[PDB]
Amino acid sequence: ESLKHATRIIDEVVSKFLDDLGNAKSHLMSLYSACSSEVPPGPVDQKFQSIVIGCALEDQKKIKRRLETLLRNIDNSDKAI
Amino acid sequence: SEESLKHATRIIDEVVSKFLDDLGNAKSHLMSLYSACSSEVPPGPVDQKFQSIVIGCALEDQKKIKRRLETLLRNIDNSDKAIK
Amino acid sequence: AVGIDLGTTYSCVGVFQHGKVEIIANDQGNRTTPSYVAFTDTERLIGDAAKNQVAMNPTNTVFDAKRLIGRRFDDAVVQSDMKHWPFMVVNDAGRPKVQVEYKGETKSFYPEEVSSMVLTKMKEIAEAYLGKTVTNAVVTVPAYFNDSQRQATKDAGTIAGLNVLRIINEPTAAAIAYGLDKKVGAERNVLIFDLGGGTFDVSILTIEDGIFEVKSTAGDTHLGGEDFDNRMVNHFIAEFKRKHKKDISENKRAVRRLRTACERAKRTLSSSTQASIEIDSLYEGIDFYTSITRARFEELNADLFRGTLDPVEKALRDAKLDKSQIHDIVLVGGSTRIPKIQKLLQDFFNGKELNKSINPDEAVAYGAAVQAAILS
Amino acid sequence: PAVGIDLGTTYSCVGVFQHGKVEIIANDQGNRTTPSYVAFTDTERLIGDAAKNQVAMNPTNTVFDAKRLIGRRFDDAVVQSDMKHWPFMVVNDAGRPKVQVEYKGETKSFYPEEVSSMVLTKMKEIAEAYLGKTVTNAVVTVPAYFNDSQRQATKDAGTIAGLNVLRIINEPTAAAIAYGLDKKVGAERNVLIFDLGGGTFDVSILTIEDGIFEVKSTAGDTHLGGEDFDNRMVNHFIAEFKRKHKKDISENKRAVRRLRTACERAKRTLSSSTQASIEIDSLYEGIDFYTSITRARFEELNADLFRGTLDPVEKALRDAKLDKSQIHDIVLVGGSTRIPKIQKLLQDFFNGKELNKSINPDEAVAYGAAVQAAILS
Ligand code: NA
Ligand code: NA
Ligand code: NA
Ligand code: NA
Structure with missing residues (x-):
């Protein structure tokens, strides 16, 4: 009873966090797709795409890489919890 | 061009800081639970109800629970480090 | 409403x-x-x-704002209580106020302002x-x-x-x-036995045709469930000294965790004749394990439990009533769950049933x- | 509050x-x-x-572009022509066009005003x-x-x-x-509104007397706007990429979409600066797109289109029975009116008159x- 109860209170904090991880990921995907040369599989933040297409070449590459790394860290954090 | 890089960075920053804040609330929640299991002076709040539930568990369960909290706080901290 | x-x-x-x-x-x-x-x-x-x-x-x-509400700063009760509170109580034109730090600002509030919150x-x-x-x-x-x-x-x-x-x-x-x-009948009497976490009140009321009248009150404003918990705490602190040669009394966190364990044990003893206490690394990494029976719990609180009968006798005297003249007895306050308390009151009233x-x-x-x- | x-x-x-x-x-x-x-x-x-x-x-x-269907017959020449540039389906419901789409797994059709209502x-x-x-x-x-x-x-x-x-x-x-x-104060005032948006061009001449408006004439080109100027740039750079790298990106929709976005951005920059850099990370087969364009080169690519905006101006004046010297105020509306060359052409047409x-x-x-x-x- 107690163990089950203590575990349930912890699982709710975790679940809520996993949901937030999910939100961050979907938001990051719309920004990453604006940088990709692939046909967008999901929504593309049109404003962000305009802005990045406007940056200098290497800054476009940096932004894409930063976004890729963030998505990887979000996934690593997801699987580790 | 230099302004575009700044505006682009801001948009990503807002997504990140938002997530980091969600990661901060989870940390505080877990921290109030962990402190309920710890014999150390609490740095912040201490969930009283959780402290009762824990103390009501078998000795090894109390150790289990505290161990699970230290792990989550660590994994949560690794996450905060990597994601800045 | x-x-x-x-x-x-x-x-x-x-x-x-x-x-x-x-x-x-x-x-x-x-x-x-x-x-x-x-x-x-x-x-x-x-x-x-x-x-x-x-x-x-x-x-x-x-906390305890209720102990100040409506009183004067120079009240003998206020002066006495503020020596046990961790927060500050200041004088404001003869009126008591609590002083605290709020947003880097030293502020004070009237007892009724705290209660309004x-x-x-x-x-x-x-x-x-x-x-x-x-x-x-x-x-x-x-x-x-x-x-x-x-x-x-x-x-x-x-x-x-x-x-x-x-x-x-x-x-x-x-x-x-x-x-x-x-209900039916004539003017009847009622004794309310109220034992909470830190206050104990005994009241005798007389109800006549739906009209209530307080006949007397007695009790102890500083006697509650927390005191029975303190007795257990001190008991286990001394127990720990004996089994592990260590004194934890000066370790806030240790004392508090023990207190929490004692509160649960007390609850358990309300429906069981024995209870077990377990606390991971209570002091210096040492695990605390032990048990306690209802009988031992009662012995630890003997003077406090039987003492609750004195205000009952005083209330009876002030109401000018014999105990056989009480028509109903009502139990209020979390601590009235303790079997020994219920038994002491019931026996005092010769087996009369309790509400x-x-x-x-x-x-x-x-x-x-x-x-x-x-x-x- | 309205x-x-x-x-x-x-x-x-x-x-x-x-x-x-x-x-x-x-x-x-x-x-x-x-x-x-x-x-x-x-x-x-x-x-x-x-x-x-x-x-x-x-x-x-x-x-999108539902407004282009309002008050139109399905068989009107402009509807049949527009339908070719639209990915969505348009059907004929008893003479009236309706956009048809899939929604929640179901086929639905909407009249153009219903889309506007949304x-x-x-x-x-x-x-x-x-x-x-x-x-x-x-x-x-x-x-x-x-x-x-x-x-x-x-x-x-x-x-x-x-x-x-x-x-x-x-x-x-x-x-x-x-x-x-x-x-304002006085007798009749003749006003010309020059409206060049992303996909349409409208010129209107209004006369205002004691706060009362009267439309005197309207002219324009329902298919002329900023998007056409971007288009000229897109085709220009597709040919330049083909010439420089021997690669035609025309059949890679994503590549064309990113290049179009880059040209739109460049166009906006040229309304404030005399030159713009156009760069795209891995545009085609990992090959970066890296070039630049001057305001003058942008104007040259669109010269005929820019000068062409004055024909409707002359037609509106003629229809309103007014000489250009009789226009008291000129108003600019529509994102594309930001283009310097367009403003200069219009200002010169009106002998240096200041524009609103x-x-x-x-x-x-x-x-x-x-x-x-x-x-x-
Ligand atoms: Na523990
Ligand atoms: Na409620
Ligand atoms: Na009071
Ligand atoms: Na008061």
Whole structure:
């Protein structure tokens, strides 16, 4: 009873966090797709795409890489919890 | 061009800081639970109800629970480090 | 229209509906809310959240406001109490005020302002449950409160944006909860035995044709469940010294965890003749394990338990009644759950049955809710 | 509090006049204009920015340009021509065109005014989110050339969106009101409104006497705008990429989409600077696109189109029986009027006359409508 109860209170904090991880990921995907040369599989933040297409070449590459790394860290954090 | 890089960075920053804040609330929640299991002076709040539930568990369960909290706080901290 | 039991340590709010009373739970599902208020560098906290941060912010976490409400600073009771509180009490034109640090600002508040905050939380709790805005309420106070304390309590309700339909006596509310005012016969007597977490009140009421009259009151304003917990704590601190040669008394965190373990053990001893206490790394990495029987628990509190009978005898004398003249006995307050307490009172009244079917922590609020429905 | 809504072909804008000041309302993403896009998916109906963000993944169920169908017959030559540039389906329901899409797994068709009604709903909600009150009264604008049925259909679209349309006013009249041209002193004033947006060009001549407006003439090109200037750039750079790398990106939709976006950005930059860099990370087969263009080269690519904007000006003048020297005020509306060369050509045509342009050209119509809405309620 107690163990089950203590575990349930912890699982709710975790679940809520996993949901937030999910939100961050979907938001990051719309920004990453604006940088990709692939046909967008999901929504593309049109404003962000305009802005990045406007940056200098290497800054476009940096932004894409930063976004890729963030998505990887979000996934690593997801699987580790 | 230099302004575009700044505006682009801001948009990503807002997504990140938002997530980091969600990661901060989870940390505080877990921290109030962990402190309920710890014999150390609490740095912040201490969930009283959780402290009762824990103390009501078998000795090894109390150790289990505290161990699970230290792990989550660590994994949560690794996450905060990597994601800045 | 809701009924509120404004207790010294915890408060409860109920509402009459569907011909029955419903005791409303708060956000955390707790049917009672600590009468605490905390002031931090950023916010103000009320209830559980206030109590959960007591350890990190002791000097800015207020409680027992009810012990000051309506009193003068130079009151012998105030002067005595402020020597045991971790927060500051200052003099303001003969009026007592609590002084705390709130947002880097040294501020002070009147006892009734602190209570209005507790009432506000109770108001918000009731609103979340009913869905509508709650404004009408019946609030309770100890039967021994004077006009000054009653008015200050009403004002606290007013400040909280409530329309206090009436200020009624806690014991009267308990008697109403058991419908001891609706039956056949002539003028009857009632003894209310109220033992909470830190206060003990004995009241004798006489009910005649639906009309209530307080005949006498007695008790001990500093006797409650926490004292029975202290006796156990001291017991285990001495036990630990013997088994591990270590004294934990000067380790706040250790003492508090032990206290929490003792509270649970006490609850268990209310339905079991034995209880087990376990605490991971209580002191210097050492695990604390032990047990305690009901008999030993009773021996540890012997003088406190039997002492509750003295105020009963005093109340009887002041009412000019023989114990055989009491028609009903009502149990209120969480601590009335302790078997030894119930047995001592029952034996004192030669086996007379005790009114206790209503959750002792909610009876007062229950009765006030009923009265609120009648005055709404 | 009544609001003013510019129901545009490509984007819409809502504003409100309170405390003697017009406020152009930003949407949930902080954008002062909202795309007149409506999309249908397996689970929901998106409108505005969210609808436009997912056009690439859901092209056939994302509707736009509905305004171009208002008051049209399915068999009208312009509808058949426009249908070729639209990914979504248009069908003939008893002589009337209807956009058809898949929604929640079901085939649905909508009349053009119903799509407009959806956009008005979005604009209504944007306004309410800002005002914190219910928005019911509004003034909605329409092109000056709209007939009775077209105006009535727009009004009905507003009514169905839950709006009490106080009045349907002409876009050029709204622009004239934004500049307070109807509050000036004197005898008749002739005003020319030069409106060059993303996909349309309209010229209107209005006469104003004692606050009363009369449309004297209208001219323009329903298919000329900023997008065509970007188009010239896109084809130019596709040929340049082909010449330099021996690679034709024309069949890679994503590549073309990113290049188009780059050209649009470059075009905007050329309205403020004399040169722009155009760079795209891994445009085709990992090959970066890296070049630049001067304002002069941009003007040259569009020369015939820029100079062509004066023909409609001359036609409007001729039809209004006015000599160019009789125009008292010139108003610029539409994002493309920001192009320096266009402004210079127009200013020279009118012997150096100063142009009214201080008000953001993308917002002038909403602005004037907001002002008139406050007056009407
Ligand atoms: Na533990
Ligand atoms: Na008092
Ligand atoms: Na007071
Ligand atoms: Na509640």
